[PDB]
Amino acid sequence: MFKLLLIFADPAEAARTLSLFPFSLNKENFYTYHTENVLLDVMVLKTWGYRGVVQALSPPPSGYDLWINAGFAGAANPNIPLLKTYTITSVKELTPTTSVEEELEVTPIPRLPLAQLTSVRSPYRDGFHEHLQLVDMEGFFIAKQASLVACPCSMIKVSSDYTTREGQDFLKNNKVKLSQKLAEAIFPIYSSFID
Amino acid sequence: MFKLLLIFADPAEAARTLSLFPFSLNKENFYTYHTENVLLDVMVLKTWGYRGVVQALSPPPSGYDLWINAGFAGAANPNIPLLKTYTITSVKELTEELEVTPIPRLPLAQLTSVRSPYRDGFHEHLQLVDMEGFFIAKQASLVACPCSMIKVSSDYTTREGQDFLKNNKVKLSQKLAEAIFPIYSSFI
């Protein structure tokens, strides 16, 4: 039996994937679906409050065969079109006040185009940057937690906004379309693990 | 049972973390708490700096799965805000370098340990400055134990910068406690 964990940072990212299968809420307060040889679980990091907390994935869930982090990401290079779904090759965490970084490779999803991801705590609105591609908040955290249980981790990120103040309106107004892109990318992965 | 050792350089730094759990006092400056899954011990140094590290951690304690050194640190760069909790990626001695294991979901910084106080202003090469971290990481390596550090920015390294630390001791100690509590729960 193949056990797949999907991790979304927030409910808007998760919404359309949760509509794809007849999930039920279990007694542990997260979503679960199974059929044939596949268990499909969904966890959403930030349902409450102004920020996610480390205890969203600490201790990390054990027992899965693959984690997929699917979410929205800002585009910090204008040659990235919006509403495009990428898989991530490596994810960096950046601390702007010190410029210290950490970086981890992640497992690319077949037949999605490749991109690099940087995770930063604050929403990114400075502008465009030569050396950044996609920008999110939670990707690095999730990949590092996956390493603690030696579970492979893959990422799907859809370009959701350009990283400017004015660019944030697009994200605000297109959350359903963006969530739908994530759902459309997850389904063929789920389908390929049916034995 | 996971076994966690926390090391603080003085009581003020330790104070709010000690309030998080109903610790027992094993002996002077050595507190212990356990559940079925986790042993949490806290050692507070009897004096600051490398002398206090040698006194407390030579021989280094064996048997732990992780050491965490939590403390106040000076900011040697004005781009570092005060009252901010960092985890350390590497530590060097000012007057030799060691990798340190970052705690998840904390901003990242590099640490420089000095053997005498550092009111020597801003050096564009330095980030956070303390007196104990390098020596603690060195003792952890003797027992092949991972070491992590939590350092909250407590002062700038300019003249009279300790006034900010002195005025904010409780808030700074509470910041350390709030960063430590979830580490404990990461092992339940």
Side-chain angles (χ1 to χ4, degrees), chain A residues 1-35 37-120 122-164 167-171 173-195, chain B residues 1-35 38-47 49-50 52-91 93-94 97-114 116-118 120-122 126-188:
Chain A
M1 193 146 183
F2 191 85
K3 301 176 178 187
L4 176 51
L5 176 60
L6 310 178
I7 303 166
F8 296 93
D10 60 42
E13 291 177 340
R16 293 303 314 157
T17 294
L18 289 170
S19 185
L20 291 184
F21 306 98
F23 287 102
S24 48
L25 185 71
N26 63 23
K27 62 185 192 301
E28 293 79 39
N29 206 10
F30 65 93
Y31 304 102
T32 187
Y33 171 68
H34 68 89
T35 194
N37 67 290
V38 184
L39 173 67
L40 189 60
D41 289 347
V42 177
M43 297 176 77
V44 182
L45 297 182
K46 183 183 175 179
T47 59
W48 262 26
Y50 291 95
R51 65 178 187 175
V53 301
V54 58
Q55 293 178 241
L57 273 180
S58 174
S62 59
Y64 293 97
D65 298 294
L66 176 67
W67 295 8
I68 299 176
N69 171 217
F72 303 158
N77 186 316
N79 69 18
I80 299 173
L82 302 190
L83 284 165
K84 185 163 173 71
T85 305
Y86 294 87
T87 188
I88 305 303
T89 54
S90 66
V91 56
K92 300 183 181 170
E93 180 76 43
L94 172 66
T95 302
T97 53
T98 60
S99 295
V100 180
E101 305 188 324
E102 50 188 351
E103 190 180 356
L104 290 168
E105 202 74 10
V106 281
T107 300
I109 299 295
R111 290 179 295 271
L112 288 170
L114 308 178
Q116 297 177 254
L117 180 67
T118 294
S119 300
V120 291
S122 296
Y124 205 76
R125 305 178 177 184
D126 299 328
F128 299 87
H129 299 277
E130 309 210 329
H131 283 335
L132 299 177
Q133 290 175 27
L134 298 176
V135 184
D136 79 339
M137 290 173 53
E138 295 297 343
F140 187 92
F141 169 70
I142 296 168
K144 179 65 174 190
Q145 293 307 96
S147 82
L148 290 181
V149 289
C151 187
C153 186
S154 295
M155 289 183 184
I156 301 172
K157 299 284 165 168
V158 60
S159 50
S160 59
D161 58 283
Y162 292 112
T163 54
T164 67
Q168 297 316 292
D169 278 324
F170 188 89
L171 165 61
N173 289 324
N174 288 275
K175 287 183 184 172
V176 171
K177 286 187 187 172
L178 288 163
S179 184
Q180 184 66 23
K181 290 289 180 94
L182 296 181
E184 291 173 352
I186 287 169
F187 176 76
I189 303 173
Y190 168 85
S191 173
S192 73
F193 285 103
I194 289 174
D195 171 76
Chain B
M1 279 182 78
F2 197 84
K3 295 178 174 193
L4 184 53
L5 175 64
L6 308 182
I7 304 155
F8 295 88
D10 59 46
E13 295 179 48
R16 297 301 313 156
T17 292
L18 290 174
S19 210
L20 295 171
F21 304 94
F23 287 102
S24 291
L25 190 63
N26 275 336
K27 56 173 183 177
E28 181 185 0
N29 280 13
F30 184 10
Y31 304 82
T32 189
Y33 177 70
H34 73 269
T35 65
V38 184
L39 169 73
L40 178 59
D41 289 344
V42 181
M43 296 180 53
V44 180
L45 306 183
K46 294 179 179 179
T47 172
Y50 73 93
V53 174
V54 173
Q55 202 290 316
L57 295 171
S58 195
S62 59
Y64 295 98
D65 298 294
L66 177 64
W67 295 16
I68 297 182
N69 170 219
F72 301 169
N77 176 313
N79 298 313
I80 296 169
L82 302 190
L83 291 167
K84 186 170 181 74
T85 308
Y86 290 89
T87 189
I88 303 305
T89 58
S90 65
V91 62
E93 193 179 355
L94 181 66
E97 183 169 333
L98 296 172
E99 281 185 14
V100 183
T101 301
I103 297 294
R105 217 179 174 89
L106 286 173
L108 307 171
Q110 302 182 340
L111 182 65
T112 295
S113 298
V114 297
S116 309
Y118 184 96
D120 189 51
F122 293 145
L126 299 191
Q127 295 175 26
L128 296 179
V129 180
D130 79 336
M131 296 187 55
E132 297 83 23
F134 183 85
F135 317 103
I136 293 169
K138 194 72 174 176
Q139 295 310 100
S141 79
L142 290 171
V143 290
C145 191
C147 191
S148 293
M149 303 179 184
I150 303 171
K151 297 284 167 163
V152 60
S153 50
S154 60
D155 56 282
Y156 289 115
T157 53
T158 48
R159 183 201 308 226
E160 305 303 312
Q162 299 287 112
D163 290 356
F164 188 89
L165 185 161
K166 289 176 178 175
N167 179 80
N168 288 282
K169 270 189 191 187
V170 173
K171 288 181 182 178
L172 289 163
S173 187
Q174 187 69 22
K175 291 278 193 144
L176 296 175
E178 292 176 345
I180 285 164
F181 212 45
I183 301 176
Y184 174 82
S185 66
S186 78
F187 300 114
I188 296 170

